[PDB]
Structure formats: C-alpha cells, structure tokens
Amino acid sequence: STAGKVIKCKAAVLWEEKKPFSIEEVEVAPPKAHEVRIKMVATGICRSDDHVVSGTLVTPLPVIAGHEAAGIVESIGEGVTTVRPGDKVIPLATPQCGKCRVCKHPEGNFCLKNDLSMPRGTMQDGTSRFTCRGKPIHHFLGTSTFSQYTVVDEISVAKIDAASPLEKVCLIGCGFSTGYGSAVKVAKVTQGSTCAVFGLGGVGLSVIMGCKAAGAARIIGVDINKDKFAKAKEVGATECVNPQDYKKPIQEVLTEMSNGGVDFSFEVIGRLDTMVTALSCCQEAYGVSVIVGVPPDSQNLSMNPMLLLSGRTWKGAIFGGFKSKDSVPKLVADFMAKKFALDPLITHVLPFEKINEGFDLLRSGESIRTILTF
Amino acid sequence: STAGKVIKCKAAVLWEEKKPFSIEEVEVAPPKAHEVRIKMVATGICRSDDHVVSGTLVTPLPVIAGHEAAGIVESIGEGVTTVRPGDKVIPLATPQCGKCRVCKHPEGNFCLKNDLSMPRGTMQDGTSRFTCRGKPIHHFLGTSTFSQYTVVDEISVAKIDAASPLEKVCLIGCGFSTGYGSAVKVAKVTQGSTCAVFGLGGVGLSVIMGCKAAGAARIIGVDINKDKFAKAKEVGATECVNPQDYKKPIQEVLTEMSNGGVDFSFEVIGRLDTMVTALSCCQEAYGVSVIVGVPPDSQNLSMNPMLLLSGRTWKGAIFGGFKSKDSVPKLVADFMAKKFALDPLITHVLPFEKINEGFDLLRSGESIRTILTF
Ligand SMILES: NC(=O)c1ccc[n+]([C@@H]2O[C@H](COP(=O)([O-])OP(=O)(O)OC[C@H]3O[C@@H](n4cnc5c(N)ncnc54)[C@H](O)[C@@H]3O)[C@@H](O)[C@H]2O)c1
Ligand SMILES: NC(=O)c1ccc[n+]([C@@H]2O[C@H](COP(=O)([O-])OP(=O)(O)OC[C@H]3O[C@@H](n4cnc5c(N)ncnc54)[C@H](O)[C@@H]3O)[C@@H](O)[C@H]2O)c1
Ligand SMILES: OCc1c(F)c(F)c(F)c(F)c1F
Ligand SMILES: OCc1c(F)c(F)c(F)c(F)c1F
Ligand SMILES: [Zn+2]
Ligand SMILES: [Zn+2]
Ligand SMILES: [Zn+2]
Ligand SMILES: [Zn+2]
C-alpha cells in the first residue's frame, strides 16, 4: 500500500517570507514511533498562517504552513494508541501531552511541548519528515496541513466522529474554538452583560457566537472594515462601530455607549494599540479584557498601570483556553448535535491548488474563512 | 458643647511637596448634611501618605493628608443615619455610596465617588472644611486624618465595635485590609500554591498573611532591604530573596525556584519595572499577578503582550477588593475574635506631634507601621 513507504505528494511550500506559496511535489517520510501520517481532506486559511508569510510570526523557513485542518489517518507508527488508520482526525496546533505541569493544571492549556514559544519547526524528536527538491522542509506548530499528507506527533492529533463533515469541522482546529472559548471559558461572559469585540474576522465572529451563547445582552462589534458588520450582526452583534467614523478615540465612545465601560472586551486583531484600547474600554473597577490577536514579533506595548490598579483584569489565551485533545472531539460532537453553527464562518471553498488565491481573499478583506479541499 | 461650632485644633498641614509637615492650628467647620465630624484617636503612616509628600501621588496642595485611622464621632450633620456621636469609627479612603454601578456589582469596590481618579481634595460637595492661617486647606481621599478633628462624608465612614482598640484597628483602614484582601479576595490564592510577594512593608506583610491564611505552600518574599526578611518569615514567608544578590534578573531566578513560574505574584512596591517582573515570574499558562503598589503619577510601563497571550492573568485592586463600608466592621469583628494579628505590623508608636519623626522612620527603611496617637 503506502504504509511504511515514503509518499510523494503535492504540498504548498513557503521558501521565503513575503512570497506566494509554491505548489510542488514533496516526499513525506513514514511515521516513526508515536507519530501519525494523515491524508488531508480540508484546511482553513487562518490569519496566523498569513503572519508566517508576512513575518509578523517568526518560524524557521522553508516551511509547510497550515494548522486548521481535518483529514484521515493513513498510517501510525509504533506505540500509537489514540488513533488508527481510517480515523477522521484534527491536528492540534497546541498539543496536549497530558504529563506536564500545565496539562495537569485544571485551567492550563498551553502545553509545554508546544512549538510556539521557541519555534524549532520540527517533530518532537527534532527532525523533519518533509523533503523537497533534495532539501529538508520545516514543520509549523507540529501540524503542517498545507500538504496532501502530513506527519504529526500523537500528542498533536485528536480522533473525531467518523460521520463528521471534514470540510466544516476543520475550523474547530483553530479559529472557531479560539473565539468561542475566549468568550465562554477565558472571559467567562455573564448573562445580561455588555461585551465589545475588536475585529470581526473568523475568530472575532466566533467570540460573538460565544458571547451570545453565554447570554450577553449587548455585543458591540468593532472593525475598520464595515463590510464585516452584516455577518457580525447575523451571529449576534447588537451594534457595530467603525473607529474611523468618530472624532474621539473609540475607548471613549465605547465607555459612553456602555454608561461607564463594558463588562468584557476582546482584542481579536493583533495590534498593540487595540490591545490597550480594548483594556481601557472595560469598566475600571470590574471589567475584564482578553487578548486573542497575535501582534508582531518582539514589539512591546505601553500602558498606564492605573488601568489595572482600579480593578480591571487583563488576560490572554491560546486556543480559547481549551485543553486541545480533550476538547476537540467534544466540540465536534457538539457541532454534530447542532449546539453551534460553522457555516457563517465559511465564505469560500476552493481546491487546494488555489491556496494563493485564498490568501489574496483574506488580505483583501473579502473572506472570513476559505476552506481548501484536497 | 462643640456641636454646631467651629473647632480650633492642631493638624499636620503640608504646604508644599518634599517638605516636613507643619503642626499648627487649623479651624474645622461643623458637619453639613450627611457629614460626620470625628475626634481622631490614632492614625498610621502609610507609604501612600509619603507619596503625597514626594509627588508620586498627585493631589491638590496645601493639604491635610492621612487616611489610615480610627476615632470617635464628635457630631453628625443633618440626615446622618449610620453613625452617632460617641461611636468609634474608621474613615474610608475608598467610599461606599451603595448606589453607583460599582457598589451594586458583586465584585466591584472602587466606588465612583472616590477622590483618587480625578483628585479634587474636597468634601463630596466640592468645598473644604479646613482653614489654616485664614486659607482653605485641601482634604485627602475624603479622610484627612492628620488632624485632631476631621470632617468626612457619611459614605466615607464605618461604625465599628465599641470595644475595639483604636490604636490597633486603624490599620484595617488601609494597609492590613489591602494586603490581606489582595491575596484572599483579588488573587484568590489556593491551597498548596506558590506565591511571590514583591515588597515587604506593611502592605506586603499583610499579603503574606493572606497567602498563609489561604494555605499557600510556598511564599517567597522579595525585597532589596534584607532587614525586612525576619518579619516576613515570622508572618509566613518560607524563603526571602534580595534581587541585588543575583547576576540574573529576578524573574528568571523565581521561575527557576518555582520549577517554571509561580502560581500567584504580587507587586507591593509601586515601581513600573517590578510590575513587569512580577507578571513575568508567574507561570505563563495559568499564573496570576496582582498589582497593589501605586505607580508614579502619569508614567506608563512597557511590556510584551505575549506574556498575556500564553495564558497569564494580570489585575490590580484598591483596598484589597473589599467594599469598604460593608467590610471594615466585619474585619474589626474578626480582629476582636483573633482571626488575624495586627501587632506584627506595628513597629513604632509616637505622639501625633512627632509625625515628622514617624515619616523619617518610614523613609530610612526602619519602620513598618508607626502609629501616631492624638
Ligand atoms: N490566540 C489564539 O489562539 C489565536 C488563534 C487564531 C488566530 N489568532 C489571531 O487572532 C487574530 C484574528 O484572526 P482572524 O483569523 O480572525 O483574522 P482576520 O484577518 O480574518 O480578522 C481581523 C479583523 O480585524 C480587523 N481590523 C484590522 N485592523 C483593525 C483596526 N485597527 N481596528 C479594528 N479592526 C481592525 C480586520 O478588518 C478584520 O476583519 C490574528 O492576529 C490571528 O493571528 C489567535
Ligand atoms: N492598592 C491600594 O489600595 C494600596 C493601599 C496601600 C498602599 N498602597 C501602595 O502599596 C505600596 C506599599 O506600601 P507600604 O506602605 O507597604 O510601603 P513600604 O514602603 O513600607 O514597603 C515597600 C517595600 O518595597 C521595598 N522595595 C523598594 N524598592 C524595591 C525594589 N526595587 N525591589 C524590591 N523591593 C523593593 C522596600 O524596601 C519596602 O520594604 C506603596 O506603593 C503604597 O502606596 C496601595
Ligand atoms: O513568540 C511567539 C509567541 C506567540 F505568537 C504567542 F501567541 C505566544 F503566546 C508566545 F508565548 C509566543 F512566544
Ligand atoms: O478655592 C478653591 C479651593 C477649594 F475649593 C478648596 F476646597 C481648597 F481646599 C482650596 F485650597 C481651594 F483653593
Ligand atoms: Zn503538556
Ligand atoms: Zn489559527
Ligand atoms: Zn458607589
Ligand atoms: Zn494607605
């Protein structure tokens, strides 16, 4: 068959920053002990993948990017117990080793085996499974889903329901779960509360979905692209505001709208200025602000700590606070049980070969999530 | 009687920054509607009073400072219902109006009638009850307790047990309650956790008391004055560290000591740099850091928001998160019942007339709390 053998397949290789992806043939080694080789079925285009192209996020190149996906197990290495050939799976960009102090903590999810804090771009064993034109190619976040086949560590993959539609549930691999959990789990939005959400992309829409599910009475969407407002209202924004329409800074506008500050605010963009704005707009004695967006590499923000001394809480999270391997199958089960919707996030579905076109739709403001199909 | 009449008495007036207090005769007007005139019995010297002298904390001058105190009601104005002449009371530097959105919120305590955010240095009605040399003198935080008699708004005073020892319980009016609440109420320190406390003055000692009460396993005190370590261990610190002993920055030292970051850290000094260090030293995925110290006026800190995105929570609070008028009598009742100790905080006692000597003791690093007696 293909098990135990090198696979030659198509992938999208990023050779350098700020260039289009190159679609070409790569060789994918078979999985070693505690590794899983996956035939991809669908992958989403997340703004974080674009951060790798833009240099906003630094990771070793050349690289196969992509992290929000779903596929089917082709083969397993020795010692693998949690998935089998033929299983539907979602790769986990935040792993769950189950052994580190974070995995063992009731509230921690940022497993210490992650490849985000100090990226190496390899498997856990420090080597790569990918070659292209005779050269080794790096992995990204232990996932690398812009390829017909990938290899992942077992701690970076979850088995999901055999009947799930992979072309939708790939979003549970990153953007949906990130936004929804940021609201319900990280902020712990309360019934009757007022919320402000900065950035109305796939992730911000998912934060709105969570705020609405948590029973917020008011959800104010904030974006400089007013074409984003109709969909934000559809998924539960009660009002939308464009900072460019006001003479005053938007923190002041939001503080006035909310009669002295909002209960919960969320930065879902990745800009330092909006992080400080979002903080400021929450009520000074009991407000909570959650950073979800990823800002550029190695840049510090400036703020007045009196913002905090009066009582505000400021926090951030990766992947909505969800312990990844425990939560992903449950979220897919909840989707199958119609507990939330994913279609509002999906604006375009393209063949994999049109990856560059998909990125152009995101950069231009025209898409939310484009799903690529293999 | 003195009821309805101007009282001539002694107070400590601050005519300008960076100068000694002037002990001299002032005129104290009678209380107007919903105001209370108090005969002071004891007041503590808190670092925040020194911040007024140094210009760290900006409030209008000339001023009668002092905010941590206890006394006996001399008279009440029209419509006062919560205290009576002869009652023992503690002035409340953070009011509790009971009517604003913060007072009604289950968590909030920084009442919107406070005089900290936009200091006026007046009574609630925008006027002063103090004259000296024929000139109006400002109030401080609606309390002004460096005077034989003061006048406070009813929302800034709590009745307390008639049998309580005023020369002790005055510390419930600021430093004790602030440190203790910061640990038990704001951080919500958990049993078996590791805590780091930056600054071992009267408030940092009360944070240690709180961490110990909450069942922390390890409580690491941090101070550049090693003379502070013996009392910090007496009240519950398990280890103390002086950053000046180390080649590496103290956040790295604490991260290594706690095998990857502490559960709860507290900044109890008032420096921008230690606020960021304290955040950094808590574990990146589930650590909590609370700012207690008062920063220098109008100065911003610089920080990397990746510290938050991994999962840290960062918050601050006034007065330990306690709703002031509800909480102060209960804290006094608990002191009377021996639920916590105040004596460890009291290192010096002086007559009021020796207030400048009490400030010299604070500035030299020799004292924790000096209590002044009228
Ligand atoms: N924390 C996590 O685990 C995690 C997971 C996924 C994505 N992210 C990050 O979340 C962010 C959002 O991702 P996405 O996929 O939704 O991106 P996106 O590009 O689809 O949406 C961002 C939105 O922000 C808006 N925007 C841009 N500048 C703005 C400004 N100054 N003011 C207000 N709105 C502004 C854009 O118009 C857009 O609608 C990114 O930074 C991404 O890297 C984080
Ligand atoms: N949030 C509130 O409600 C509230 C209430 C009370 C006091 N405060 C503030 O809390 C702070 C502490 O008050 P206090 O009365 O305990 O003061 P304090 O001056 O007695 O104690 C501060 C301690 O910090 C130490 N310190 C100084 N610089 C240091 C450094 N670089 N590293 C480590 N330690 C250092 C000093 O040696 C001292 O022991 C002050 O800023 C004060 O204004 C805040
Ligand atoms: O530097 C990259 C980087 C991130 F993009 C994060 F979101 C994060 F939490 C982190 F710790 C990190 F190191
Ligand atoms: O005149 C304005 C003014 C006041 F309203 C005061 F309350 C005060 F203390 C003071 F010194 C002053 F100048
Ligand atoms: Zn782990
Ligand atoms: Zn993503
Ligand atoms: Zn109030
Ligand atoms: Zn004080």
User: Is the domain of B171 the same as that of B187?
Assistant: no
User: Is the domain of B273 the same as that of B325?
Assistant: no
Give the experimental resolution in Å: 1.2
Give the type of residue at B293.
G
Q: What is the CA angle B88-B89-B90, rounded to 5?
A: 145
Q: A63: helix, coil or strand?
A: strand
How many other CB atoms are found less than 10 A from the CB of residue A79?
10
Judge contact between A36 and A152, C-beta under 8 A: yes
Which residue among B34, B139, B170, B174 is the active-site one? B174
CATH of the domain at B204: 3.40.50.720
Containing structural domain, residue A136: 1-178+318-374
Q: A151: helix, coil or strand?
A: strand
Where in the sequence numbering do the catalytic residues of A fall? 46, 48, 51, 67, 174
User: Is the domain of B201 the same as that of B312?
Assistant: yes
Considering every ligand atom, which ligand is closest to the CA of B67? 8
Do the bridges between strand B88-91 and strand B157-159 make them parallel or antiparallel, or are there none, so unpaired? antiparallel
Residue B217, C-beta contacts closer than 8 angstroms, at least 6 positions apart: B192, B193, B194, B238
Residue A371, C-beta contacts closer than 8 angstroms, at least 6 positions apart: A42, A43, A44, A45, A167, A168, A170, A346, A348, A349, A350
User: Is the domain of A311 the same as that of A189?
Assistant: yes
Do the bridges between strand A68-76 and strand A149-153 make them parallel or antiparallel, or are there none, so unpaired? unpaired
Judge contact between A337 and A312, C-beta under 8 A: no
* Method underlying the structure: X-ray
Residue B165, C-beta contacts closer than 8 angstroms, at least 6 positions apart: none
CATH of the domain at B162: 3.90.180.10
User: Is the domain of A296 the same as that of A185?
Assistant: yes
User: Is the domain of A87 the same as that of A205?
Assistant: no
Considering every ligand atom, which ligand is closest to the CA of A202? 1
User: Is the domain of A309 the same as that of A335?
Assistant: no
Q: How far is A293 from chain B (nearest CA, A)?
A: 8
Judge contact between A345 and A206, C-beta under 8 A: yes
Which tokens sit at B325? 């008028």
Question: Which amino acids bring their CB within 6 angstroms of ligand 2?
Answer: A 309; B 46-48, 51, 174-175, 178, 198-204, 222-225, 228, 243, 268-271, 274, 292-294, 318-319, 365
Is there a contact between B300 and A302 if contact means CB atoms under 8 Å apart?
yes
- Closest by Cβ to B313, choosing from A101, A105, A313: A313
Name the domain boundary from B275, B291, B317: B317
Q: Is the dihedral of CA B170, B171, B177, B178 positive or negative?
A: positive
Q: A117: helix, coil or strand?
A: coil
User: Is the domain of B362 the same as that of B327?
Assistant: yes
Cα A38 from chain centroid (whole Å): 20
Residue of B nearest to A272 (CA): B305
Rg of chain B taking only CA atoms, in angstroms:
20
CA B163 – CA B195 distance, rounded (Å):
36
Residue B336, C-beta contacts closer than 8 angstroms, at least 6 positions apart: B161, B163, B164
From residue B346, give the alpha-carbon distance in Å to each of A114, A202, B341.
49, 57, 10
Judge contact between A334 and A342, C-beta under 8 A: no
DSSP string covering B80-105: --S--TT-EEEE-SS---S-SHHHHS
Judge contact between A277 and A261, C-beta under 8 A: no
User: Is the domain of B348 the same as that of B324?
Assistant: yes
Query: Looking at the 3D structure of chain B, how many domains does it have?
Result: 2
Half-sphere exposure of B163 (CA within 13 A, CB side): 5
- Closest by Cβ to B303, choosing from A109, A300, A321: A300
Residue A336, C-beta contacts closer than 8 angstroms, at least 6 positions apart: A161, A163, A164
Which tokens sit at A334? 């909840």
A330 sits in which H/E element:
helix A324-336
User: Is the domain of A307 the same as that of A172?
Assistant: no
CA A28 – CA B148 distance, rounded (Å):
84
User: Is the domain of A29 the same as that of A168?
Assistant: yes
Name the domain boundary from A317, A337, A362: A317
CA B254 – CA B324 distance, rounded (Å):
34
User: Does B102 contact chain A (CB < 8 Å)?
Assistant: yes
